[PDB]
Design a protein around this ligand. Structure first.
Ligand SMILES: [Cl-]
Ligand SMILES: [Cl-]
Ligand code: NA
Length: 129
């Protein structure tokens, strides 16, 4: 599924992400825009043989099992295919574990380079929430 901007903001808010560990809703929408262009089916392979999955590009070396990343943990205890569903619930639950692990949203490279320090509230302006 390819979400619209306000559609995703509302789904993320309903799943408990607004101000989760101090990160306002705009941060999460901005991160999804630049990681996946709001597409739940996005995948991208990395040099080390791991693959990133879904709306928040969650990585197979640490967080999900895809059966082809040898030395990998499966810390969210899900198959990586579950992160490509049009229901974002599995992605959100796993994102909450990642952002709590000490490094906050710096785990998402696009957030660090394209959202951090910017006016992220712009990403939810105009939306009925
Ligand atoms: Cl915000
Ligand atoms: Cl933090
Ligand atoms: Na894994």
């Amino acid at each position: 599924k390819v979400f619209g901007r306000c559609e995703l903001a509302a789904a993320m808010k309903r799943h408990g992400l607004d101000n989760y560990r101090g990160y306002s809703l705009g941060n999460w929408v901005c991160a999804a825009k630049f990681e996946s262009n709001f597409n739940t089916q996005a995948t991208n392979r990395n040099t080390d043989g791991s693959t990133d999955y879904g709306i928040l590009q969650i990585n197979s070396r640490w967080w999900c099992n895809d059966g082809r990343t040898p030395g990998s943990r499966n810390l969210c205890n899900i198959p990586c295919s579950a992160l490509l569903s049009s229901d974002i619930t599995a992605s959100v639950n796993c994102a909450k574990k990642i952002v709590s692990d000490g490094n906050g949203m710096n785990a998402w490279v696009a957030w660090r380079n394209r959202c951090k320090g910017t006016d992220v509230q712009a990403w939810i302006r105009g939306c009925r929430l």
